[PDB]
């Protein structure tokens, strides 16, 4: 229960993985040479961390265990030109000459299984290299149908191969307002159905919400994908800080699996991070724990184009990176309970998980970050997720009503039956979430 196998699928997934590995190297101050970096860090090198994500070899060189799968040679050449490839292993990275389709049609085809076998034996060899296993980490975007389909295939194969450790899948949700590709909602719904089939824990993060955050909080004129990747890296690091570094109240991945699943079928938590602001606001004054706890519930920090006030509260977690007083956060959560911002339920409301980690947050040079000694990452369970689901489902319904492109999908690798199944399953999940939330 110490090793976590992380996989980067698709172009956005590979970029997110590059950003997360770069941030992990920056937190521990890791350069391409290393040997840990160097072999006197304590605890920026062995032991943990890095032993959860970085495999340790005989020479002491930490190897970030990541499987960069992609069928576009441009992204593969880009990730191979950097020092990350020197940090990785050539056999761990998979190369693809021609892109599957636009975008999910061939992403789940037999061409997907031909690479599934190779990556499966590679994962088996990697697990033979290391000792123990905690969970499977996934990083792919739902906008890219190829990446989402390959990630769903990896998830299904890992569930059918081991099925012992819970599977964590970080899904990047597109902007519900604008859709760049016409096949984007179809692939999103199909990937959500595949996760419902073979995922024990998911993650919903919107790109438009991150853009609005960095425009309003960080105050940048031109948001780029690198800033979104760095913010996702900060999010993942805030989640796994308790596993990378030790704290006063360490939490395990099984604690996350228990907290985020209070019902037979509940595996859709939202992520929030606070405080996120410009550097001038941090240079002017410093905030308190109450302000950070109040900003954690704001619609901007929810990383989703939906308002959490209309949602219903369920079991939530809060991990505190840095020096954090227990009485302070207890008073803060009591004040939040007294305010009653989000409507509670009859089962969960006394479920505020509080984890503490000694590792303080790190501000990346690319994306601005509020330099604060205490950061809070909150994994919430609200019913506005169902509202965003219903919005994207009405969009998908109008599309599938016209959809202008049925013959390509029914001829290449799919059919109308699979689309109808995915639509019905998504609508069933939405109404089940609504009924289990509003049952209080």
């Amino acid at each position: 229960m110490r090793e976590v196998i992380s996989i980067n699928v698709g172009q956005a997934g590979c970029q997110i993985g590059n950003a997360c590995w770069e941030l992990y190297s920056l937190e521990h101050g890791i350069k391409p040479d290393g040997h840990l970096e160097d072999g006197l860090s304590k605890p920026k090198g062995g032991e943990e961390g890095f032993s959860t994500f970085f495999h340790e070899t005989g020479y002491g060189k930490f190897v970030p265990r990541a499987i960069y799968v992609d069928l576009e040679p441009n992204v593969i050449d880009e990730v191979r030109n950097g020092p990350y490839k020197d940090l990785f292993h050539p056999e761990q990275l998979i190369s693809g000459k021609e892109d599957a389709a636009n975008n999910y049609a061939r992403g789940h085809y037999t061409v997907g299984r031909e690479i599934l076998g190779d990556v499966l034996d590679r994962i088996r060899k990697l697990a033979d290299q290391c000792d123990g296993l905690q969970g499977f980490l996934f990083t792919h975007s739902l906008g890219g149908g190829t990446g989402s389909g390959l990630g769903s295939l990896l998830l299904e194969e890992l569930s059918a191969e081991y099925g012992k450790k819970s599977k964590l899948e970080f899904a990047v949700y597109p902007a519900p307002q604008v859709s760049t590709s016409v096949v984007e909602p179809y692939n999103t719904v199909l990937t959500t159905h595949t996760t419902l089939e073979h995922a024990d824990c998911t993650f919903m993060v919107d790109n438009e919400a991150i853009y609005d955050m960095c425009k309003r909080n960080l105050d940048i004129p031109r948001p780029s994908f690198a800033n979104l990747n760095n913010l996702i890296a900060q999010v993942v690091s805030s989640v796994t800080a308790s596993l990378r570094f030790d704290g006063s109240l360490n939490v395990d991945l099984n604690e996350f699996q228990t907290n985020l699943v209070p019902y037979p079928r509940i595996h859709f938590p939202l992520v929030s991070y606070s405080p996120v602001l410009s550097k001038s606001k941090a240079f002017h004054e410093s905030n308190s724990v109450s302000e950070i706890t109040n900003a954690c519930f704001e619609p901007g920090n929810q990383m989703v184009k939906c308002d959490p006030r209309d949602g219903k509260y369920m079991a939530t977690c809060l991990l505190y990176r840095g020096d954090v007083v227990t009485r302070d956060v207890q008073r803060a959560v009591e004040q939040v309970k007294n305010k009653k911002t989000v409507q509670l339920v009859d089962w969960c409301p006394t479920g505020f998980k509080i984890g503490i980690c000694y590792e303080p947050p790190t501000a990346t040079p690319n994306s601005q970050l509020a330099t604060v000694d205490r950061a809070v990452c909150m994994l919430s369970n609200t019913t506005s997720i169902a509202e965003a689901w219903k919005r994207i489902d009405r969009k998908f319904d109008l599309m599938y009503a016209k959809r202008a492109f049925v013959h390509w999908y029914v001829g290449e690798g799919m059919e109308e039956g699979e689309f109808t199944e995915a639509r019905e399953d998504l609508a069933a999940l939405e109404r089940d979430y609504i009924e289990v939330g509003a049952d209080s």
């Binding site: 229960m1 099984n254 228990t258 699943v261 007083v325």
Partner: protein, 453 residues
């Protein structure tokens, strides 16, 4: 009638409290951390008695008669590295099973039953090494599912392995349970075995612990190490009656004789004055309290270590131990003042019990303001409310059967119906226990024998 007691450290919290207790005992008996006694072996004259708690392998080294058992080897390795040569490496149980796969009492009992042979072999080896024995002391740490499962398995083994020994247990309860469902399930499943097999049980609610740690200490932030240090000092004070044998109570069996009126009523409530052996113990010479004020503080709800919730509390057996230079006239005055303020049941004319112990000649002597300390243990049905919290959680969550996919693995039952039936049986058991307590709170309990003769 005094015998040796073997310590049973279970779980992370249990191991921490055990390490703190052994460090406190070493500081008291001048043993130290290195294991070798700091006092020279020439001055053999010792007023205390480390034999019931320390194995005398050599004349200058006292190995504690304790066994640690945990699934997380990190805390065990840390304790072993901090106490070089103090603990016995053969009494450390990890089973090489890795980290705990969740916080479920089912997984705890599974990991206990799988390696039950190893822990029983270690217990048999310790029994063969020792010559006299009286009973075990188990640290449940019921807040953790794996620790509670391991403690329940240890109890279910010891009850039918050694029936001639008295079993005492220490269950640490949290202040505000984070995962209410899982923590209530674990506490109820451990309370089932406590009712079934455990002979004596002492509860420790973390609410009063955090309150005292915020009051008597200067730092606002509370750390788990000096939080468990409080329970360490409590166990030290309650085992003082055997370490430094007094003239009234000299055996754990004789103490539990008056501490336990019946095996059904085997849950106590502790209370202690502002400590003097903890980290921040400098703010004790500004109170200037006597034995009467010490007794008042012991009877005050602000010094108890569990959730008081004193709404006309019914007392059954109140006992106190005072360590230091105590005055008999002051004890008599305190008894006269307390017999008119403590509620006593009309069916039993038994009053509170007072015992006077001896202070260690090597401990740092405190000024005349706080040179004398006291501990109190009272049989109150106020722990029934702390239990009713978890019972209400169970009643409000069991309507749907949440978290059923976690307690189904590990245990001998993999289906949902069997786990549901086991949880319902444990809930019925704790309900019958609370009914017995609320019946003993009345006068009809003693009339149950008068109505039929």
């Amino acid at each position: 009638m005094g015998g040796e007691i073997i310590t049973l450290q279970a779980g992370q919290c249990g191991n921490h409290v055990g390490k703190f207790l052994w460090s406190q005992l070493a500081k008291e008996h001048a043993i130290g951390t290195d294991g070798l006694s700091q006092l020279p072996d020439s001055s053999t004259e010792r007023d205390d008695d480390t034999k019931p708690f320390f194995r005398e392998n050599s004349r200058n080294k006292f190995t504690p008669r304790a066994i640690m058992m945990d699934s997380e080897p990190s805390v065990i390795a840390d304790v072993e590295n901090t106490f070089r040569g103090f603990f016995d490496p053969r009494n450390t149980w990890v089973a090489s099973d890795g980290a705990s796969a969740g916080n479920s009492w089912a997984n705890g009992y599974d990991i206990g039953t799988r390696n039950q042979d190893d822990i029983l072999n270690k217990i048999d080896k310790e029994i063969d090494s020792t010559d006299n024995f009286e009973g075990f002391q188990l640290l449940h740490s019921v807040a953790g599912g794996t620790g509670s499962g391991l403690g329940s398995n240890l109890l279910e083994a010891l009850c039918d392995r050694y029936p001639k020994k008295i079993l005492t247990t220490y269950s640490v309860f949290p202040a505000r349970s984070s995962e209410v469902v899982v923590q209530s399930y674990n506490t109820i499943l451990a309370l089932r075995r406590l009712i079934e097999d455990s002979d004596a049980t002492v509860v420790f609610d973390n609410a009063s612990l955090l309150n005292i740690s915020g009051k008597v200490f200067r730092n606002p932030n509370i750390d788990l190490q000096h939080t468990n240090q409080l329970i360490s000092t409590i166990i030290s004070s309650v085992t003082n009656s055997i370490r430094f044998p007094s003239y009234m109570y000299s055996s754990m069996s004789s103490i539990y004789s008056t501490l336990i009126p019946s095996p059904e009523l085997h849950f106590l409530s502790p209370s202690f004055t502002p400590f003097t052996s903890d980290y921040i113990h400098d703010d004790i010479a500004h109170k200037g309290h006597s034995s009467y004020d010490v007794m008042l503080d012991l009877l005050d709800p602000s010094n108890s270590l569990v959730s008081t919730a004193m709404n006309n509390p019914t007392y059954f057996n109140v006992y106190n131990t005072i360590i230091g230079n105590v005055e008999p006239r002051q004890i008599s005055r305190a008894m006269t003042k307390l017999q008119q303020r403590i509620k006593f049941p009309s069916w039993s004319s038994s009053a509170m019990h007072v015992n006077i112990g001896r202070r260690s000649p090597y401990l740092p002597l405190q000024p005349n303001e706080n040179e004398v300390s006291g501990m109190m243990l009272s049989n109150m049905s106020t722990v029934v409310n702390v239990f009713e919290n978890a019972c209400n959680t169970f009643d409000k969550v069991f309507a749907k059967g949440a978290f059923l996919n976690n307690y189904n693995v590990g245990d001998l039952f993999q289906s949902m119906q069997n786990v549901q039936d086991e949880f319902a049986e444990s809930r019925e058991v704790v309900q019958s226990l609370m009914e017995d307590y609320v019946a003993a709170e009345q006068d009809s309990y003693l009339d149950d024998v008068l109505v039929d003769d």
